[PDB]
Write a protein that binds this ligand. Sequence first.
Ligand SMILES: *[C@@H]1O[C@H](CO)[C@@H](O)[C@H](O)[C@H]1NC(C)=O
Ligand SMILES: *[C@@H]1O[C@H](CO)[C@@H](O)[C@H](O)[C@H]1NC(C)=O
Ligand SMILES: *[C@@H]1O[C@H](CO)[C@@H](O)[C@H](O)[C@H]1NC(C)=O
Ligand SMILES: *[C@@H]1O[C@H](CO)[C@@H](O)[C@H](O)[C@H]1NC(C)=O
Ligand SMILES: *[C@@H]1O[C@H](CO)[C@@H](O)[C@H](O)[C@H]1NC(C)=O
Ligand SMILES: *[C@@H]1O[C@H](CO)[C@@H](O)[C@H](O)[C@H]1NC(C)=O
Lengths: 99, 595
Amino acid sequence: YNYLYRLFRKSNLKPFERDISTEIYQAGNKPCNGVAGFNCYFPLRSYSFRPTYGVGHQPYRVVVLSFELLHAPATVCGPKKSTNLVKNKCVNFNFNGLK
Amino acid sequence: STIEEQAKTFLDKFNHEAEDLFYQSSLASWNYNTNITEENVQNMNNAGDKWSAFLKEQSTLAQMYPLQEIQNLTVKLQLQALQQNGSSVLSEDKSKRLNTILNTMSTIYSTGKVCNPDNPQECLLLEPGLNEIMANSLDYNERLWAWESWRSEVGKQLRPLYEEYVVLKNEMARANHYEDYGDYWRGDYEVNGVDGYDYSRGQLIEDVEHTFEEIKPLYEHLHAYVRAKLMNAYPSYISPIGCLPAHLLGDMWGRFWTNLYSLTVPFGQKPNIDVTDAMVDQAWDAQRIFKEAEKFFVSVGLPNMTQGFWENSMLTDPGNVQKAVCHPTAWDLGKGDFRILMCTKVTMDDFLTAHHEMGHIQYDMAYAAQPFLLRNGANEGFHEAVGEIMSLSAATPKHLKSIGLLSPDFQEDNETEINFLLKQALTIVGTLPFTYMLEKWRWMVFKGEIPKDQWMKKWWEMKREIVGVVEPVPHDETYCDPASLFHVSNDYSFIRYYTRTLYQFQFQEALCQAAKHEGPLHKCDISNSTEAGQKLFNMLRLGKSEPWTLALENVVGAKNMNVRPLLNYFEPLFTWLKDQNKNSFVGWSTDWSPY
Ligand SMILES: *[C@@H]1O[C@H](CO)[C@@H](O)[C@H](O)[C@H]1NC(C)=O
Ligand SMILES: *[C@@H]1O[C@H](CO)[C@@H](O)[C@H](O)[C@H]1NC(C)=O
Ligand SMILES: *[C@@H]1O[C@H](CO)[C@@H](O)[C@H](O)[C@H]1NC(C)=O
Ligand SMILES: *[C@@H]1O[C@H](CO)[C@@H](O)[C@H](O)[C@H]1NC(C)=O
Ligand SMILES: *[C@@H]1O[C@H](CO)[C@@H](O)[C@H](O)[C@H]1NC(C)=O
Ligand SMILES: *[C@@H]1O[C@H](CO)[C@@H](O)[C@H](O)[C@H]1NC(C)=O
């Protein structure tokens, strides 16, 4: 019961928005006043994972990689594969972008 | 802001909490059923108490939303299912007395022991011994002694209990804005608010009558044939013009006639289609039986089994040290968890039962996308019907030749088709008048049409008039002879078997015309046909979200139930019974001429 999801909110989230509020959801006309009674629900519900659930209900760990480019100098580069060095022959050399 | 959005948010929170509490309850019941130990018993009792209190408080919060301002049919259906009081509408003392009455009916039926006078040093229970002595014995007075002794003892200990039970259930139903308890049981078939597909609670009884009016000639011929064969069994006691004696029906109550296949065989010299020898010679274990059933279900186009099904189901008896319930049960634990509790023996009957329970599991699997309170059959007949159609299709000789149990050089002549169809008629057509009689008696005793001191006289007369079975001796109102059956004694609806029987052959005709079968209906196999599986899965995916009339129109095209598929199934047997009943007398008389 350490994993929770938000079941109710008054509006949809913006993209890449994090909502960590535990304010009591206002489903009724009367004010909730912080007490989860009639028409007032705690907005966060627990995913109760057990090792005997189907493939549609087993826990899935998700990591989402978002790649952004900014006016700053881009410093996250991929690994550059290096061919073994050959000498004493007329070859095409590419050293650190110098060709 | 409106009431309907409040209902949707409340139903979402109820469904989230309900699927978890349901899983805990179902897993505790499973741990009790596969492992009968006292800590599993108290865990099941705790989980059941938590589940019942949860539905009590959620129905308390659910009855604050009126239904007349809700236009969505799914939300209205979930709130109508949720707001049902059950036994909670009464005072606490009367509700406690009703649960006490139900518990003591359960303990009287479960621990009812009836044995021989003057030999009391041990005695014999109903489920181990009385079923065997009713199905296997050929002695007239011994079956009469067991029948009369069990009905006498059980009737004298259960008659005032049923006397209070009918009054308490009538007060419960009239407090729940129903006319009677029969109307409460017919409310499962009620469809309201949908134009063209509307079905009332009151119409079902004449609908059953309308089906039974066409049931009645075929059953009469079968009854005459059974009477002729019982004339071979019993020479002088049964009359040609009269009804059957009651303790000769092969069961304790006459519900099934399938124990008379040895006595009523058309051609005893011909062998049966029992394929047990092929399983035991080739060593067909239970795991590969379920693999073959999975192969059948992917042949028809339905999705295959989950990995947790194969991991968590116990398909074999575990041993002497661990005790488990041997009753075949399909379990939908929730959260995508599906299991089968089955102590498989290497027989053809357990093979057909495994197909039946995997049909149950596939039906439970298809409506998993639905909300939790709509995760059921559209009525009580569909859930058993979709398993019984698999039991129909797996029992065909073509399917047994397909999977290697039956030899390709097997000759399928008309005689083995006649005796197979007669076995199916003794299983299927035999239970229909008993079911209709019992349900119509229960409907009139809840309605108050039957007076209190006239029960047995009316009941036996209907057994003379509907089933064509006469009592051995007259019984007065000190006895309660209906209450000896399991379903009526433990508060169970009985019309589900009638509706299941009709929907079985309706679904069978719809799939066999979907799969383009060019012969008679009893030869038909739904294997290797994707379009029939898609047509069926269109009904399996709905669950309880749609009316059962709409689901029936999705399968067979007709919203109302139909009796023509059942007589079309038994058509060559009907012609055969018309051929061989020329010397015998078709039909019965209500007089006591046999006994
Ligand atoms: C069944 O219950 C007993 C009682 O403690 C336990 O020892 C045994 O492991 C249980 N069986 C299984 C398969 O868990
Ligand atoms: C009814 O509510 C369900 C949500 O449970 C929604 O998917 C469906 O579209 C609604 N139907 C109508 C007609 O509003
Ligand atoms: C359930 O019982 C309560 C208490 O008597 C009652 O107020 C309520 O109307 C009942 N529900 C229905 C649907 O009749
Ligand atoms: C079910 O079928 C799919 C594809 O047909 C397959 O990938 C999967 O492994 C199968 N699962 C089982 C348990 O056989
Ligand atoms: C089966 O068909 C043959 C061929 O006409 C016929 O002689 C025989 O009587 C039939 N048997 C039954 C039981 O219909
Ligand atoms: C159905 O398909 C399976 C798999 O190809 C095959 O083994 C079986 O013989 C087929 N059944 C029929 C009746 O053709």
